[PDB]
Design a protein around this ligand. Structure first.
Ligand SMILES: COC[C@H]1CN(c2ccccn2)CCO1
Lengths: 39, 156
């Protein structure tokens, strides 16, 4: 069986670690909910 | 069980030890997570039971105890925060500027942050703290890096 356990509040943290890029990708979504790249 | 608003880990004792299969959001008495985390199964919160209420495999979303409540949207311009809850690790906010998933049915925001599979269902937030979507359904691009969609449901 699956169970839930609290992990925290949902708040914006000022001065959180800023990382990650912003790629623009052509993608397709199938009936099973799987995303794939369109080329 | 615990009905306080906040982020929660989705755990299972079926496998070896206690394993974290995902994360979710409690808001207005409803638990929100990704479909691939629970497969639509019932959830336990202490002595209490959470039953599925709405779900969709294509959207890869599921709600418990009531209808989907999260309706905030990425403004398409500003940085956001992934409130990542990794297996066995403390909740941690990560700021990023989202990319774009261009589909035949419109554009969706995307976050290029790489975390373990059991981090699926972690909320993405705007500057106001509102949940604009869940992290965990995406694609693996050329250089093997992971890019998740900012997956948001519909509030009826
Ligand atoms: C090279 O690919 C790395 C993994 C990343 N995965 C994730 C990551 C975060 C949340 C859900 N799934 C999907 C499977 O591939």
């Amino acid at each position: 069986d699956m169970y839930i356990e609290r992990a925290g509040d949902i708040t914006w943290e000022k001065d959180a670690e800023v990382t990650g890029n912003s790629p623009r990708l052509d993608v397709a979504l199938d009936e099973s909910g799987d995303f794939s790249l369109v080329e | 069980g615990e009905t306080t608003d906040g982020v929660y880990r989705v755990m299972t004792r079926r496998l070896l030890g206690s394993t974290q299969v995902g994360v979710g959001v409690m808001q207005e008495g409803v638990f929100h997570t990704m479909w691939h985390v629970t497969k639509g199964a019932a959830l336990r919160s202490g002595e209490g039971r959470l039953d599925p209420y709405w779900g969709d495999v294509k959207q890869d979303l599921v709600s418990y105890c009531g209808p989907w409540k999260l309706d905030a949207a990425w403004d398409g311009l500003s940085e956001v925060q992934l409130l990542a809850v990794p297996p066995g690790e403390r909740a941690k906010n990560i700021q990023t500027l989202p990319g774009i998933f261009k589909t035949k049915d419109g554009d969706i925001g995307a976050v290029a942050l790489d975390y373990p599979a059991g981090t699926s269902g972690s909320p993405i937030l705007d500057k106001c703290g509102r949940v604009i979507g869940l992290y965990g359904n995406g694609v693996v691009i050329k250089n093997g890096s992971y890019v998740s969609a900012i997956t948001q449901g519909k509030r009826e």
